Design an enzyme around this catalytic site. Structure first.
Site, mmCIF file in Angstrom:
data_model
loop_
_atom_site.group_PDB
_atom_site.id
_atom_site.type_symbol
_atom_site.label_atom_id
_atom_site.label_comp_id
_atom_site.label_asym_id
_atom_site.label_seq_id
_atom_site.Cartn_x
_atom_site.Cartn_y
_atom_site.Cartn_z
ATOM 1 N N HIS A 176 0.723 -1.058 0.281
ATOM 2 C CA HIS A 176 0.093 -0.033 -0.039
ATOM 3 C C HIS A 176 0.834 1.353 0.007
ATOM 4 C CE1 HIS A 176 0.516 1.392 4.189
ATOM 5 N NE2 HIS A 176 0.186 0.073 4.618
ATOM 6 N N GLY A 227 3.309 5.215 10.487
ATOM 7 C CA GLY A 227 4.578 5.286 10.069
ATOM 8 C C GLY A 227 5.119 3.983 10.577
ATOM 9 N N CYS A 281 3.915 0.957 9.793
ATOM 10 C CA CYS A 281 3.548 0.017 8.656
ATOM 11 C C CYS A 281 4.857 -0.593 8.176
ATOM 12 C CB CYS A 281 2.829 0.409 7.417
ATOM 13 S SG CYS A 281 1.052 1.118 8.072
HETATM 14 K K LIG Z 1 2.323 6.486 -1.753
#
Ligand SMILES: [K+]
Ligand SMILES: [K+]
Ligand SMILES: [K+]
Ligand SMILES: [K+]
Lengths: 306, 306
Positions: free
Chosen positions: A41, A143, A145
């Site tokens: 993502h 942040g 992830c």
């Molecule tokens: K992006």
């Protein structure tokens, strides 16, 4: 001798954490050999997130769209592929600090250590359990992830979790390092219900064994039970059924303490029915369920990691 | 979202852990530069422990009486000195993995990460608090001695604890890395009462602030209180007095949440008097007191470490 939520040493994983940037997203990636793994993502804009076609978004990406920083060192991306929901960036440089590792898909109940990172840099380390509803009750910010969960066996890091998202309820969801979500989740900004959470029975038992090893014996009772009669009571209190596999895995602890699993089960039955009467087990007034049988052995027997 | 007992990354400290053997006693040591630090009780036999004269026992020791193993690598001891209750073994080899470090003496209430080791090898990492009675409620087994507690600021490891002994109550005691015990304890096998343990009030408050940041607001009540009226109620429940310094340190969290410290105090007063009524704060049915105000900020603001 005590008993704590105790994480693996993080050193082997600290050396693998990099910063991965694409478009408007910075998150973390996992640098093993010449590959950086991160949640795919990262390739999405805010608007892409609502209904992403990842195959098409990636086709339109180039190696140069991806900025990977390892410390003060830019890694040059020389290739990019997608495995389920994980992005694999081939880089020009094998991580010299790559440990021995495997990628393992854990089961609900099982625990792991999380190395929470921001900007490719570790913030802290804590112990987690994969909840029966495939969520994890992490401590993660924006942040985080790309942060990973892992276990260590001897010298081998088993990476079992990569963080992808936080649900509205404040619990977290992610993938194995092959990119497959745990649970019915998708990397799409669309409403997604966590199943109803239950209590990890085998872990509560393991933790009661832990209590016995640490001296607490008050909850041991003169009652006995069959597995099936136990599971009937468990169900009523939103406990996961106890399987035979669970009884088998509790074997070591049953042998160490001398208390049989079905004996321990009857003790849990009564704790569930009557409560604790303002007593505590290992400092806790609630039944704790985020310690596996193995976790207990390791903490109570002193297993080290090379 | 979420809130965990979260330890610093252990990587920088993992590289300093060695095995130190003397006579039949094996424990852990801390290898920084060309010095290995370990508890000096390693030089004692079972019988020496009852009434050791350390100055005399050490004079009768030779460098060769000490075996230091770092990984599969024997370090040769080329000198030995004693600083208070820590043994300093000069070795032939500076640790190539020595981090930036300081040796800090922490105060009661302050927290730190413990890297529990056996045989010079890390077993796990967990977060701890120096209790008001100068003990720590660790998870330690036989062979854990020499294990250290630390904090990390940017890239600097502050070593604040080295484990020396477990008391009969199952709580632990140790020294700073200059060898001075925290509390009225001695490295002697003689009966030693821990002072009565109290609850770290400022930390409970900080943790309630943490609960507010994570959405839990039920324990907020319409009452307010003066500091002095609070400390009167605190006393009764075995809580540490709340100082003005404590109110000042809670300032950041009071500003972040908008809830004033004395307001939060009144909320704690009621929790102490009436209880929780089977409700929970951050998953806990007990008031948790092993998070400092800074720990809360760090976890809720996301500060990382290099
Ligand atoms: K992006
Ligand atoms: K029984
Ligand atoms: K700390
Ligand atoms: K209030």
């Amino acid at each position: 001798s005590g008993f704590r939520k105790m994480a693996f040493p993080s050193g082997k994983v600290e050396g693998c954490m990099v910063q991965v940037t694409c478009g408007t997203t910075t998150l973390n990636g996992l640098w093993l050999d010449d590959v950086v793994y991160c949640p795919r993502h990262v390739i999405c804009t805010s608007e892409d997130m609502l209904n992403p076609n990842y195959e098409d978004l990636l086709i339109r990406k180039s190696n140069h769209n991806f900025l990977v920083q390892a410390g003060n060192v830019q890694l040059r991306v020389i290739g990019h592929s997608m495995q389920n929901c994980v992005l694999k960036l081939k880089v020009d440089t094998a991580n010299p600090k790559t440990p021995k590792y495997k990628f393992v898909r854990i089961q609900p109940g099982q625990t792991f250590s999380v190395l929470a990172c921001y900007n490719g840099s570790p913030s802290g380390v804590y112990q987690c359990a994969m909840r029966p509803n495939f969520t994890i009750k992490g401590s993660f910010l924006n942040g985080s992830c790309g942060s990973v969960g892992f276990n260590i066996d001897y010298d081998c890091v088993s990476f079992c979790y990569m963080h992808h998202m936080e649900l509205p309820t404040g619990v977290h969801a992610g993938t194995d390092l092959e990119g497959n979500f745990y649970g019915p989740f998708v990397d799409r900004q669309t409403a997604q219900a966590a199943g109803t959470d239950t209590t990890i029975t085998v872990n509560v038992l393991a933790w009661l064994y832990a209590a016995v090893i640490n001296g607490d014996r008050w909850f041991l009772n003169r009652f006995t039970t069959t597995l099936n009669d136990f599971n009937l009571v468990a169900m009523k209190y939103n406990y996961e059924p106890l399987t035979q596999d669970h009884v088998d895995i509790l074997g070591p602890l049953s042998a160490q303490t001398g208390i049989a699993v079905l004996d321990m089960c009857a003790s849990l039955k009564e704790l569930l029915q009557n409560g604790m009467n303002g007593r505590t087990i290992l400092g806790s007034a609630l039944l704790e369920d985020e310690f596996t049988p193995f976790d207990v052995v390791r903490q109570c027997s002193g297993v080290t990691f090379q």
